[PDB]
Enzyme design. Structure first.
Site, PDB file in Angstrom:
ATOM      1  N   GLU A 138     -49.960  -7.361  34.375  1.00  0.00           N
ATOM      2  CA  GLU A 138     -48.838  -6.392  34.423  1.00  0.00           C
ATOM      3  C   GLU A 138     -48.980  -5.268  33.400  1.00  0.00           C
ATOM      4  O   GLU A 138     -48.817  -4.107  33.770  1.00  0.00           O
ATOM      5  CB  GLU A 138     -47.499  -7.088  34.241  1.00  0.00           C
ATOM      6  N   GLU A 167     -47.361  -7.227  44.992  1.00  0.00           N
ATOM      7  CA  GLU A 167     -48.718  -6.861  45.397  1.00  0.00           C
ATOM      8  C   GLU A 167     -49.418  -7.899  46.300  1.00  0.00           C
ATOM      9  O   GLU A 167     -50.617  -8.068  46.202  1.00  0.00           O
ATOM     10  CB  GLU A 167     -49.562  -6.625  44.121  1.00  0.00           C
ATOM     11  N   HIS A 194     -52.944  -3.169  41.445  1.00  0.00           N
ATOM     12  CA  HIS A 194     -53.130  -4.620  41.314  1.00  0.00           C
ATOM     13  C   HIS A 194     -54.281  -5.206  42.168  1.00  0.00           C
ATOM     14  O   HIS A 194     -54.680  -6.329  41.919  1.00  0.00           O
ATOM     15  CB  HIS A 194     -51.836  -5.362  41.762  1.00  0.00           C
ATOM     16  N   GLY A 248     -38.840  -4.200  42.164  1.00  0.00           N
ATOM     17  CA  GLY A 248     -39.311  -2.975  42.828  1.00  0.00           C
ATOM     18  C   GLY A 248     -40.271  -3.242  44.011  1.00  0.00           C
ATOM     19  O   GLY A 248     -40.060  -2.731  45.111  1.00  0.00           O
ATOM     20  N   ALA A 249     -41.323  -4.018  43.734  1.00  0.00           N
ATOM     21  CA  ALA A 249     -42.300  -4.353  44.824  1.00  0.00           C
ATOM     22  C   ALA A 249     -43.246  -5.425  44.366  1.00  0.00           C
ATOM     23  O   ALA A 249     -43.228  -5.894  43.186  1.00  0.00           O
ATOM     24  CB  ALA A 249     -43.093  -3.105  45.258  1.00  0.00           C
ATOM     25  N   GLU A 289     -44.299 -14.736  44.124  1.00  0.00           N
ATOM     26  CA  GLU A 289     -44.504 -14.694  42.655  1.00  0.00           C
ATOM     27  C   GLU A 289     -43.186 -15.015  41.983  1.00  0.00           C
ATOM     28  O   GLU A 289     -42.151 -14.573  42.456  1.00  0.00           O
ATOM     29  CB  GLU A 289     -45.014 -13.307  42.232  1.00  0.00           C
ATOM     30  N   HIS A 331     -48.686   1.359  41.493  1.00  0.00           N
ATOM     31  CA  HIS A 331     -48.718   0.108  40.746  1.00  0.00           C
ATOM     32  C   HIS A 331     -49.229  -1.020  41.648  1.00  0.00           C
ATOM     33  O   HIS A 331     -50.124  -1.740  41.279  1.00  0.00           O
ATOM     34  CB  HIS A 331     -47.310  -0.184  40.199  1.00  0.00           C
ATOM     35  N   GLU A 332     -48.612  -1.169  42.832  1.00  0.00           N
ATOM     36  CA  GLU A 332     -49.043  -2.304  43.668  1.00  0.00           C
ATOM     37  C   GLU A 332     -50.484  -2.139  44.128  1.00  0.00           C
ATOM     38  O   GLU A 332     -51.217  -3.127  44.242  1.00  0.00           O
ATOM     39  CB  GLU A 332     -48.117  -2.488  44.884  1.00  0.00           C
TER      40      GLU A 332
HETATM   41  C1  LIG Z   1     -42.594  -1.616  39.919  1.00  0.00           C
HETATM   42  C2  LIG Z   1     -42.217  -2.082  38.495  1.00  0.00           C
HETATM   43  C3  LIG Z   1     -43.553  -2.473  37.861  1.00  0.00           C
HETATM   44  C4  LIG Z   1     -41.581  -0.930  37.657  1.00  0.00           C
HETATM   45  C5  LIG Z   1     -41.171  -3.260  38.405  1.00  0.00           C
HETATM   46  C6  LIG Z   1     -41.529  -4.322  39.472  1.00  0.00           C
HETATM   47  O1  LIG Z   1     -41.108  -4.234  40.605  1.00  0.00           O
HETATM   48  N1  LIG Z   1     -42.338  -5.299  39.071  1.00  0.00           N
HETATM   49  C7  LIG Z   1     -42.936  -6.286  40.021  1.00  0.00           C
HETATM   50  C8  LIG Z   1     -44.422  -6.114  39.898  1.00  0.00           C
HETATM   51  O2  LIG Z   1     -45.068  -6.237  38.840  1.00  0.00           O
HETATM   52  N2  LIG Z   1     -45.011  -5.697  40.994  1.00  0.00           N
HETATM   53  O3  LIG Z   1     -46.418  -5.597  40.926  1.00  0.00           O
HETATM   54  C9  LIG Z   1     -42.450  -7.625  39.983  1.00  0.00           C
HETATM   55  C10 LIG Z   1     -42.841  -8.372  41.108  1.00  0.00           C
HETATM   56  C11 LIG Z   1     -42.317  -9.696  41.210  1.00  0.00           C
HETATM   57  C12 LIG Z   1     -41.436 -10.214  40.253  1.00  0.00           C
HETATM   58  C13 LIG Z   1     -40.845 -11.492  40.470  1.00  0.00           C
HETATM   59  C14 LIG Z   1     -40.970 -12.563  39.591  1.00  0.00           C
HETATM   60  C15 LIG Z   1     -40.283 -13.734  39.880  1.00  0.00           C
HETATM   61  F1  LIG Z   1     -40.418 -14.765  39.084  1.00  0.00           F
HETATM   62  C16 LIG Z   1     -39.494 -13.850  41.003  1.00  0.00           C
HETATM   63  F2  LIG Z   1     -38.817 -15.023  41.279  1.00  0.00           F
HETATM   64  C17 LIG Z   1     -39.356 -12.789  41.831  1.00  0.00           C
HETATM   65  F3  LIG Z   1     -38.500 -12.992  42.922  1.00  0.00           F
HETATM   66  C18 LIG Z   1     -39.990 -11.590  41.612  1.00  0.00           C
HETATM   67  C19 LIG Z   1     -41.047  -9.414  39.124  1.00  0.00           C
HETATM   68  C20 LIG Z   1     -41.614  -8.140  39.006  1.00  0.00           C
HETATM   69 ZN   LIG Z   2     -47.032  -5.598  38.873  1.00  0.00          ZN
END
Ligand SMILES: CC(C)(C)CC(=O)N[C@@H](C(=O)NO)c1ccc(-c2cc(F)c(F)c(F)c2)cc1
Ligand SMILES: [Zn+2]
Ligand SMILES: [Mg+2]
Ligand SMILES: [Mg+2]
Ligand SMILES: [Mg+2]
Ligand SMILES: [Mg+2]
Ligand SMILES: [Mg+2]
Length: 889
Positions: free
Chosen positions: A324, A268, A305, A265-266, A124, A301-302
Site C-alpha cells: 500500500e 485490485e 498494484h 475506494g477500490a 481483502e 492506484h489499482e
Molecule cells: C484508493 C485509496 C488508496 C485512496 C483508498 C482505498 O480505497 N484503499 C483500498 C486499496 O488499497 N485499494 O488498492 C482498500 C481496499 C480494501 C480495503 C479493505 C480492507 C478490509 F479489511 C476489508 F474488510 C475491506 F472490506 C476492504 C481497504 C482499503
Molecule cells: Zn491499494
C-alpha cells in the site's frame, strides 16, 4: 480477543495447489461448491487441519470424496473448521465442501454481497473465508478454476479472474461461465461479479512486447455514460508504468467495475478491479471537479498494484505497507506527472500533516509495520498508506531517479511471482545505494527504523553565517516523542532536500542538495557562500516530519514570494499562519479564562498581507497555489500544536485572522473572482469527457475559495454573485453557491434548487448531501434532522451515511457544541451502523480520534460517548477493539 504478533510468523503445515469453485447464485441463497487440491508441507507436524470459514452453512464436507461426519471427524464453530489430524491424509489429498451463503442480506459488504442489483465480492483482507473454507492468509498461493451460474435475465454478465474459457446455458432460465486463472495468487485477490452490466471498452497495445490488452469498464445501465474518464485514466496508468518503470501488463484483459455499495475506494483483484462508483464514474454535468482527480488516482492506484501487490505479493498482513505505501507512492508519481500542477503534491502533504499526524500523536499511533493486530479491518490506516507512501518516496529522494529506478527494478525482478516482506524492498534499495555511493559497505540498516518506529519526528534548526569566511552552517536536530510503542526513540535516516536563497535577488546559491541526517544532531557547513542566505528546507516535503524552521516572518515572506520550491513556499505561509494562530489563540484564551472586560489582539503581520496581495495579483502565478495561501491551515493540522484545545476559542481565532486579512484584501478577492470567470468556467469542452484541464479546475477552486471568503465577509451585493453562480453548469460552482449562501436568507431557496438538480443521479445526490452537511448554518442540527427524515432514511449505503455525517463533524463551532449534542449524535450513528457494517462504523469514529487533545470539558464529553458505545452489548469486534485502543483502556 485473538492477538496476532508479527514476530510469530510461521509457514503453514499445509499447501493448497488448486482451487476449483462452483458458485451458484439463487434468489434466496448462493451455494458454493469447492474442491481444494492440497498437500502436506515440510513444516507440518501432524497438526489438525484448520480452515477459516466465517458464517458458512455446511451442506457437506469430504476428504478424497469420502463424506466427513461432524463431532467425530470435524468440528465447526462458525469461525474455524477443524478436521482432527487422525483424519487428515499424509500426502496429496482433495478437500471438498458445499456451503450456503446469503449475499442479499450481507450488509457488511465483505465476502460475497449484493449491491443494488449486482452480486460482487470483497475479499481483502480475510473476506474469502466468508465465501468458502480456506487457509485464508496471503502466503497460501494457489491456482483457481471458477464457475459462476445465475439467472440469465437478472445476471447476464458474469466475471471472475483469469480467462473466460466456457459459457453455457442451464435449464430454467440460467446460464454459467467458467474462468480459469492459472498463475498462483493469494485468495484476497479472488473476485466474482454478476449483474446486468453495461460497458465501454478499448484495446491497448503494450510498449515493448506489443501485446493486445482488452480494457473493459462496467457499470449499471443507468450510469454507463459516466464511464469514459475512467477508461482514459486506465490507458494513462498503463502508459506511465511503461514509461517510468518499464513495466507492461501481462494479461490479455483488464476489467474495472463500479458498484454503489463499497466500504472503501477500490480493490485490485487481479484482472477484475472493483470500485466504489464514486471513484470510477463521472460526467461534467453530474460530478464535481474533485471526481476527476479522484478517479485518476484510484484507477491508477489499482492498476499499479498489478506489480506492487499482485505479481509481488505479501508474505503476511504485517507487510501491508509494502504493497500500500509503495502503490500510493506510484500513484502519486503518476498523478503528479498527469496533472502538471504543484497542488497535487501539496494536497498529499496537506492530508498527511493533518489526518496522519493527528493519528500518529493519538492513542492509536502505530508504525507503518505494526507489531500486532486484532482486527485486519482496522489496519488499513492513513499511517500505513500515507506515511508508508512518504517512506517509500524518501528512497527516491535519497537515491535520485536513475538509481531509484535501478533499485525498483531489482525489487521487481527478484520477487516477481512470489510473496515478499518490507526487508526485501529495503534490500533492493540498499543495492542501489551501494551503487550510488560507490561503496559496497554502505547500508540502509538504519532506514528500517522507518518501518518499526511510530510517532512523527520533529526536526529543528539553528544557523550561523560568517561573512568574512563566506561560510554558512545549518545545525539540525531530530527528536521523536516517546509513546506506547517505544520508550526510547532512535534517530532516523532523514533526507533533507535544501536550497539556499540569496535574499537580495532571490536566486539559488547552491546546486541541488539532499542532506542525510543520520544522527540525533549534525552540523552541515557550506563554503563560498557570498552573502547570508535564507535556507529553503525540506523541499518537496522531503521527510514526514514536523519542521521547525526557526525563521523570522520576514524570512518566511521572502521565501513565500521568491523561493523556487512550491512546498517550502506553502510551508513558509503555513508557518506564518501558525505563529499568528497560536498567538491570538492564547490572547483569546486568557481573555476567556480571566473574564476580561477588554483586552488586545496581536494583528496579522501587514507585510504578510502585502505578500498575499502580491502573489494573488501576479497573473503568472498558479491558481491552485493561490487558493492555498488565502486558506488557514486545516483545523486538524492546528490541533497538533495546542494542548487542551478549546474549539470555540480556535473558531474565534480563525474568524479574527480571516477578518483581518479580508478587511485589507476583499476588493482584490472580488476583482479576481470576476476576472477569473472567463477561463475558469469556459464551456468549450463541457461535452467532451476525455478532455480534463487540471489548471482550469484549480481556477474554479480559487474562485470558489474567494467566493466563500467574500460571502462570510458579507461583501457588498455579493449575494448577486452567489445567485448567478448557482446557474453555472458546473456542479463545483452550483454546489458552492449552496454552501456560501448559508450566510444569506436565500439558503433554503438554493437548498431546494440544488436538491432538484442533484436528486436523479445517485453520486451527485451524495455530493449534495456533503454540501448540506458542511454548510455553515446556525440551524445545522435541524437541517441534519431534515436530511435524515427526507433523504437518508434507513439507507445502509456507506456513501449515503458518510455523506450526511462526516462533513458536519468538521464544523468546528457546531460539531463541538459544548452541550455534547454533536458527539451524542455521531455516537448514535456509529452504534446504529455497527449493527450491519462494523468497518464503516469505525470510519465514523474519526472525529473522536483527537478527543484527548481538546479542552477538559470536551474530553469528558467525548469519553462519555465512547464509553457509552463500548457498553453496547452487541458491539462488533472492530468497533470494540478500536474504541478500547482509542480510550487507552
Ligand atoms: C484508493 C485509496 C488508496 C485512496 C483508498 C482505498 O480505497 N484503499 C483500498 C486499496 O488499497 N485499494 O488498492 C482498500 C481496499 C480494501 C480495503 C479493505 C480492507 C478490509 F479489511 C476489508 F474488510 C475491506 F472490506 C476492504 C481497504 C482499503
Ligand atoms: Zn491499494
Ligand atoms: Mg452465513
Ligand atoms: Mg506509450
Ligand atoms: Mg490518493
Ligand atoms: Mg559555521
Ligand atoms: Mg441508493
Amino acid at each position: 480477543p485473538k492477538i496476532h504478533y508479527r514476530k510469530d510468523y510461521k509457514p503453514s503445515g499445509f499447501i493448497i495447489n488448486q482451487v476449483t469453485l462452483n458458485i451458484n447464485i439463487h434468489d434466496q441463497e448462493t451455494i458454493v461448491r469447492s474442491v481444494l487440491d492440497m498437500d502436506i508441507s515440510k513444516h507440518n507436524v501432524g497438526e489438525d487441519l484448520v480452515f477459516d470459514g466465517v458464517g458458512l452453512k455446511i451442506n457437506e464436507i469430504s476428504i478424497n470424496n469420502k463424506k466427513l461426519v461432524e463431532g467425530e471427524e470435524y468440528t465447526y464453530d462458525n469461525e474455524f473448521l477443524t478436521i482432527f489430524s487422525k483424519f487428515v491424509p499424509k500426502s496429496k489429498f482433495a478437500f471438498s465442501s458445499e456451503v450456503i451463503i446469503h449475499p442479499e442480506t450481507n450488509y457488511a459488504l465483505t465476502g460475497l454481497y449484493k449491491s443494488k442489483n449486482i452480486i460482487v465480492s470483497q475479499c481483502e483482507a480475510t473476506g474469502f473465508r466468508r465465501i468458502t473454507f480456506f487457509i485464508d492468509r496471503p502466503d497460501m498461493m494457489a491456482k483457481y478454476d471458477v464457475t459462476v451460474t445465475a439467472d440469465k435475465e437478472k445476471y447476464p454478465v458474469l466475471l471472475s479472474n483469469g480467462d473466460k474459457v466456457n459459457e453455457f446455458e442451464i435449464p430454467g432460465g440460467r446460464h454459467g461461465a467458467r474462468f480459469n486463472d492459472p498463475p498462483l495468487k493469494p485468495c484476497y485477490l479472488f473476485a466474482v461479479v454478476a449483474g446486468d452490466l453495461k460497458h465501454l471498452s478499448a484495446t491497448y497495445i503494450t510498449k515493448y512486447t506489443k501485446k493486445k490488452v482488452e480494457l473493459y469498464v462496467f457499470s449499471e445501465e443507468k450510469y454507463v455514460s459516466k464511464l469514459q474518464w475512467a477508461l482514459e485514466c486506465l490507458k494513462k496508468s498503463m502508459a506511465f508504468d511503461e514509461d517510468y518503470f518499464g513495466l507492461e501488463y501481462d494479461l490479455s484483459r483488464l476489467n474495472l467495475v463500479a458498484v454503489s455499495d463499497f466500504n472503501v475506494g477500490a480493490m485490485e483483484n487481479k484482472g477484475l478491479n472493483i470500485f466504489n462508483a464514486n471513484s470510477l464514474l463521472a460526467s461534467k454535468k453530474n460530478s464535481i471537479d474533485f471526481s476527476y482527480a479522484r478517479i485518476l488516482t484510484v484507477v491508477g492506484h489499482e492498476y499499479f498494484h498489478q506489480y506492487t501487490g499482485n505479481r509481488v505479493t505479501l508474505r503476511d498482513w504485517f507487510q501491508l505497507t509494502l504493497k500500500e505505501g509503495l502503490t500510493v507512492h506510484r500513484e502519486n508519481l503518476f498523478s503528479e506527472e498527469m496533472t502538471k500542477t504543484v497542488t497535487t503534491r501539496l494536497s498529499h502533504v496537506d492530508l498527511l500533516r493533518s489526518v496522519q499526524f493527528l493519528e500518529d500523536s493519538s492513542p492509536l499511533s502505530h508504525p507503518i509495520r505494526p507489531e500486532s493486530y486484532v482486527s485486519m479491518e482496522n489496519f488499513y490506516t492513513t499511517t500505513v498508506y500515507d506515511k508508508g507512501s512518504e517512506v517509500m518516496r524518501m528512497y527516491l529522494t535519497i537515491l535520485g531517479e536513475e538509481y531509484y529506478k535501478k533499485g525498483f527494478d531489482i525489487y521487481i525482478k527478484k520477487n516477481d511471482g512470489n510473496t515478499a516482506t518490507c526487508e526485501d524492498f529495503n534490500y533492493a534499495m540498499e543495492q542501489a545505494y551501494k551503487m550510488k555511493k560507490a561503496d559496497n559497505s554502505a547500508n540502509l540498516n538504519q532506514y528500517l527504523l522507518w518501518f518499526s518506529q511510530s510517532g512523527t519526528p520533529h526536526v529543528s534548526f539553528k544557523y550561523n553565517y560568517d561573512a568574512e569566511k563566506k561560510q554558512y552552517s545549518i545545525h539540525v536536530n531530530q527528536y521523536t516523542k516517546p509513546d506506547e510503542n517505544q520508550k526510547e526513540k532512535k534517530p532516523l535516516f532523514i533526507p533533507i532536500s535544501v536550497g539556499l536563497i540569496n535574499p537580495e535577488n532571490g536566486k539559488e546559491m547552491i546546486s541541488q542538495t539532499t542532506l542525510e541526517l543520520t544522527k540525533e544532531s549534525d552540523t552541515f557547513v557550506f563554503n563560498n557562500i557570498a552573502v547570508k542566505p535564507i535556507p529553503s528546507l525540506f523541499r518537496g516535503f522531503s521527510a514526514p516530519v514536523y519542521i521547525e524552521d526557526q525563521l523570522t516572518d520576514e524570512e518566511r515572506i521572502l521565501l513565500l514570494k521568491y523561493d523556487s520550491d512550491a512546498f517550502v513556499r506553502y510551508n513558509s505561509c503555513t508557518n506564518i499562519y501558525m505563529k499568528q494562530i497560536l498567538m491570538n489563540y492564547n490572547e483569546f484564551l486568557k481573555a476567556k479564562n480571566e473574564k476580561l472586560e477588554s483586552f488586545q489582539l496581536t494583528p496579522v503581520n501587514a507585510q504578510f498581507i502585502d505578500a498575499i496581495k502580491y502573489l494573488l495579483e501576479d497573473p503568472h502565478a498558479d491558481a491552485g497555489f493561490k487558493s492555498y495561501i488565502v486558506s488557514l491551515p486545516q483545523d486538524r493540522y492546528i490541533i497538533n500544536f495546542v494542548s487542551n484545545l478549546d474549539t470555540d476559542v480556535l473558531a474565534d481565532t480563525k474568524e479574527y485572522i480571516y477578518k483581518q486579512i479580508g478587511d485589507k484584501l476583499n476588493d482584490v478577492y472580488y476583482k479576481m473572482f470576476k476576472s477569473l470567470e472567463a477561463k475558469a468556467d469556459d464551456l468549450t469542452y463541457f461535452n467532451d469527457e476525455s478532455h480534463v484541464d487540471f489548471d482550469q479546475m484549480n481556477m474554479r477552486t480559487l474562485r470558489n475559495t474567494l467566493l466563500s471568503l467574500l460571502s462570510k465577509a458579507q461583501y457588498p451585493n455579493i449575494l448577486n454573485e452567489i445567485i448567478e453562480h448557482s446557474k453555472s453548469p458546473y456542479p463545483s460552482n452550483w454546489l458552492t453557491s449552496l454552501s456560501v449562501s448559508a450566510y444569506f436568507d436565500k439558503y433554503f431557496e438554493l437548498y431546494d434548487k440544488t436538491y432538484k438538480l442533484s436528486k436523479d443521479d445517485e453520486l451527485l445526490l451524495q455530493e449534495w448531501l456533503k454540501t448540506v452537511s458542511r454548510s455553515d448554518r446556525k440551524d445545522i442540527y435541524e437541517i441534519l434532522k431534515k436530511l435524515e427524515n427526507e433523504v437518508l432514511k434507513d439507507s445502509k449505503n456507506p456513501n449515503d451515511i458518510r455523506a450526511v455525517y462526516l462533513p458536519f463533524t468538521n464544523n468546528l463551532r457546531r460539531f463541538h457544541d459544548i452541550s455534547g449534542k454533536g458527539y451524542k449524535l455521531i455516537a448514535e450513528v456509529i452504534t446504529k451502523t455497527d449493527k450491519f457494517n462494523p468497518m464503516v462504523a469505525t470510519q465514523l469514529c474519526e472525529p473522536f480520534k483527537l478527543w484527548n487533545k481538546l479542552d477538559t470539558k470536551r474530553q469528558e464529553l467525548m469519553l462519555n460517548e465512547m464509553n457509552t458505545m463500548l457498553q453496547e452489548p452487541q458491539i462488533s469486534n472492530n468497533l470494540k477493539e478500536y474504541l478500547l485502543r482509542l480510550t487507552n483502556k
